[PDB]
Amino acid sequence: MKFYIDDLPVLFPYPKIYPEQYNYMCDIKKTLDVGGNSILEMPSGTGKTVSLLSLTIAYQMHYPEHRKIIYCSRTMSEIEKALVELENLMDYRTKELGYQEDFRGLGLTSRKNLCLHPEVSKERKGTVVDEKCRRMTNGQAKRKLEEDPEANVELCEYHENLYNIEVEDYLPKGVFSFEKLLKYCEEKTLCPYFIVRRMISLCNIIIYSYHYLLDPKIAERVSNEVSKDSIVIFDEAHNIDNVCIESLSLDLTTDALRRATRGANALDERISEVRKVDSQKLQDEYEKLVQGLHSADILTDQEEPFVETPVLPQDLLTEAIPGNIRRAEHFVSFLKRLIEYLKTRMKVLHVISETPKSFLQHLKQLTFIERKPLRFCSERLSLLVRTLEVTEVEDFTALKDIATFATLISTYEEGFLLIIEPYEIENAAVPNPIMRFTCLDASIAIKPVFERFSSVIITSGTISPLDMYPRMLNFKTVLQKSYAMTLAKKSFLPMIITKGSDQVAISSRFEIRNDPSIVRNYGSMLVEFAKITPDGMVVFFPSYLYMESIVSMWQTMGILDEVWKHKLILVETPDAQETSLALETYRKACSNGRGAILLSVARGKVSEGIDFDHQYGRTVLMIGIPFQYTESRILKARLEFMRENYRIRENDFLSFDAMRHAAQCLGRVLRGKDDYGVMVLADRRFSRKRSQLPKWIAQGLSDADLNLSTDMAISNTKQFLRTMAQPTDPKDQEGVSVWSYEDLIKHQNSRK
Amino acid sequence: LRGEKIMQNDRGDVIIDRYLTLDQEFDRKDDDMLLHPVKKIIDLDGNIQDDPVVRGNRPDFTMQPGVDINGNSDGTVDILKGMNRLSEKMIMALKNEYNDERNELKIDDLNESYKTNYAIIHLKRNAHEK
Amino acid sequence: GGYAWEDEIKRSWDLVKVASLVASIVEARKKRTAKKNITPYQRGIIRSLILTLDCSEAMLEKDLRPNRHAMIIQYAIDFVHEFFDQNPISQMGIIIMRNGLAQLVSQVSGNPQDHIDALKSIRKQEPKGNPSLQNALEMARGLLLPVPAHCTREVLIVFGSLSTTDPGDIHQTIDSLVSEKIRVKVLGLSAQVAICKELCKATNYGDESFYKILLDETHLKELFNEAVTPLPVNKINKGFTLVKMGFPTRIFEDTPTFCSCHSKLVYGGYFCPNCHSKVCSLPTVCPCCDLMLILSTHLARSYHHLMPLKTFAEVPTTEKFRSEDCFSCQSRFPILLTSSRYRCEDCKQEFCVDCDVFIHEILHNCPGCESKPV
């Protein structure tokens, strides 16, 4: 339906619109016109991807600026969901407008998800795919084949075919999802990865995960193609800080250092062999280094650096190589003694936490190494590997980790902490020392983003309090608000269970996990909700180890046996593919009427992206507050840093972290407004944390339901499910919970 | 078979225990048969592999399978996989010889309401006399 | 940390401290609003209904006193009586889901006594096991095969559980049902089920109003009574056709004679107008020349469905009244706020509330309309 905003038209792809969607669009337009960041929180039940996409596309297709759109998402699954919505929106626009507009849409992703080569695609590791794909497309193989056809070096027909056709004609104009893109590429025998990456400039809207915008390893190349004035949108940004913290981090183990020595020894042997046969290859690169040329100038566009720049692009030094590492052999000695120094520090018998400056000072005192040579460790290693032209890099992969460590620790000095702990797993007979370079400041990685792009839309279904993110992540917001959902009837029934049937308090504290009273009460609670839940029941545990212990106890108690009668039991597992198969079976059981229950982790992989709507989610059971492991060196260091710098209490952040992960799981139950589901927060400590929930979830929570028992919750659930199945009078939601075109026009006139 | 955790070697049975290796081989074959490409909407392997170069901090032991003092697996994951295999076996057995995702994603509540198409007839009350 | 004892006393007596006629009218008007819209939708008078009842562990629940099994069986008896009284030509069959299998308890026939007896026997049977929609639907699909094409296939599942254990893919059965033009009505007992909703919607040409879950004991009877009336048909579906039938004549005989239907001695019967064979009771297919014998009354009972009487509209209070007494029953309209007079549009004659319900539920012809001379 064509409905207008202050000065532009919007083509919503549905005959009727929610009141929340219109308000959400109006605020987004206000932010775009005024500019600056904004934190919006729309209810998960109301459609949000469709509303946001419809407005932004209309904004660029109408205004003279024709600004591009960058749409970020947590995971790949979200990218495909958004892409499907975008294509549906485009189809509606073409029909109403008659002519298909000059619009292009793609989505960046790793090589593994797009590779079509029969051999490389079969690889189980994304990095292994990159190594094989680069080998066939580095350009060395093609040049060698041209020089001597007798050479047996293989190529990739998919990559070669792209050369014949121009870049602007790789794909027909329109929106290309991963499924559609793969189908077209397979028919035309082309590589989706290169087509998608090479078309970033042409695309009007580009959809890719946060790791393609905050991780400098795979962001510096992409960030150069996107336009500066593009609109940036962060969808489901309630966990963005974790990505920023996890981008500039690194962990080194004893095995990593052992392989580093092996790689360095192999590197020295290879250099000697290359020197014997022909030393002219090294001389040419040495002359370039003296001239001051860096990897960017030396390496061609087709080739890629062996070690991706671990530090942010702006922090990389621009001066020439120091000289101590100019020669091939001198750098090897520099690399060797650096590795030995790390091995020495692994022998500490107690936890030692120190700043990067102290680590550098001690390093220099023992083995003479300065800050500046370390900053060029990653760059120099890539050049040396390229010069040696090693066909196989299986051994040298270890040196990559060491090179990353040197640059990270020699570039940043504030906001990072180096922690060495002799016991990685406390429950280990023999210590396995591990040294962690952890990032404490979540704003270091996102600082370039906010400085580059003028307008950023930070939106998420479950994101609260909105005042924390501006504090935790240093940025200012012109507008920030949360929208309450105008619903005709109570679509969701949140409840905070604090006691079992026997009136005994229940909590998921990790130190009393093996408590028969707590274990049995959760077991009885799971069975009772399985008896009354029609099709789907999702259970979220605080940690995977907690899930294992509880399930094992339930099996001995025989509680799972009673569950098997009513529902199939699917459990999340560390293997990613097996979990995907479990989800497929869980969905099938819900759809065919058999009924299934999914046991997963609140802070696991299933919670980030998989939406359990309509029949899939009819009851969500939260077994305990998903608290983080308090006795963790990384968490303690971050909390101390945050308290001293951003003035956030340790307890406040821990509650904030736990509640965000519980809220996101709760919000996956609802897709629309007709969908209904019962949310259960089974823990004693949830009683006093109602105010910390998202506003729309809190509004549905009642004082009576703030402290409930298993018996009361089951009786309450039975009545709710029975009521929600009855037909609803259209007049009740005719013009309050849903708006037709006439209702929207009437509301607009009333405002004026 | 019933998912009970395998306690320390008990009496068991001399003869039946010899088939444990065959049973494990059958389970591996069944797992291979069950494994198949998954719809990209719900695929989780791509999500973890969407950033192949990420090497952030390793998660604490609370986010990893339990391990013993010697470092061997606790064994709880084995029974959990059995539950998944049993459920998958049941669901797959149902489907015996005897654009789709796009429709599901669309929000139905905002679509036009279903309209009945019942026929109407007006009979003529003009019949011949006896 | 004081307890609730120390706070105060509840003081229950403090809580208690010290227009109906118009409310009834407006409530009636709101209820009458749903009855305002009525059009002569074409409905299939001849029908074949397979009644599927859930007899599983879920029936042992005490939600419906004494137990779900007892109330469902008892109301089934009433439904059988009502179904065969409103629709005399229709045939019915009974299936029950028990022990994970669909068990046939009465062949599809047109004799209400057989179905009533079958339900009576099921009374003592104790429900157990899990229900199986696919097994019941597959059995129902087979039962509705011999039925003539002109008959409208119908399935009325009374589902009580929340989970279904099937041996195969139930989605295939749903597609098969649509191919055979079978419409399924499901009366859930506890909560909505994804498969049940899909089955009703797919088989009812996308209509989602054929899956209903009750909310109390009283609502169950209304749901059972609603299924008695025939269902409308869609425009696209075509089943127009003629059916050969005859009207036999009751014959009185001094000496009893053998009946062709049951081969039993009966004093009287109906002689077929084609083969002269005698049949004990009507309406049933002739045992010899397989033409459905019926009386003119059986056809008459279904006429009111074809041409329903238009709903009456309450007269405004301001406007004058035709007379001070009801036209039909001569009951004075109470003087009372709002006049309690209802007039038929065609003949413009006021009626009382008692007549309004009677003239649209039991009596199917407006007294004034017949009195009016054309």
Ligand code: SF4
């Ligand atoms: S060029 Fe494309 S198809 Fe060929 S190996 Fe690389 S990712 Fe795979």
Ligand SMILES: [Zn+2]
């Ligand atoms: Zn007889």
Ligand SMILES: [Zn+2]
């Ligand atoms: Zn006959």
Ligand SMILES: [Zn+2]
């Ligand atoms: Zn009267």
Ligand SMILES: [Zn+2]
């Ligand atoms: Zn009349």
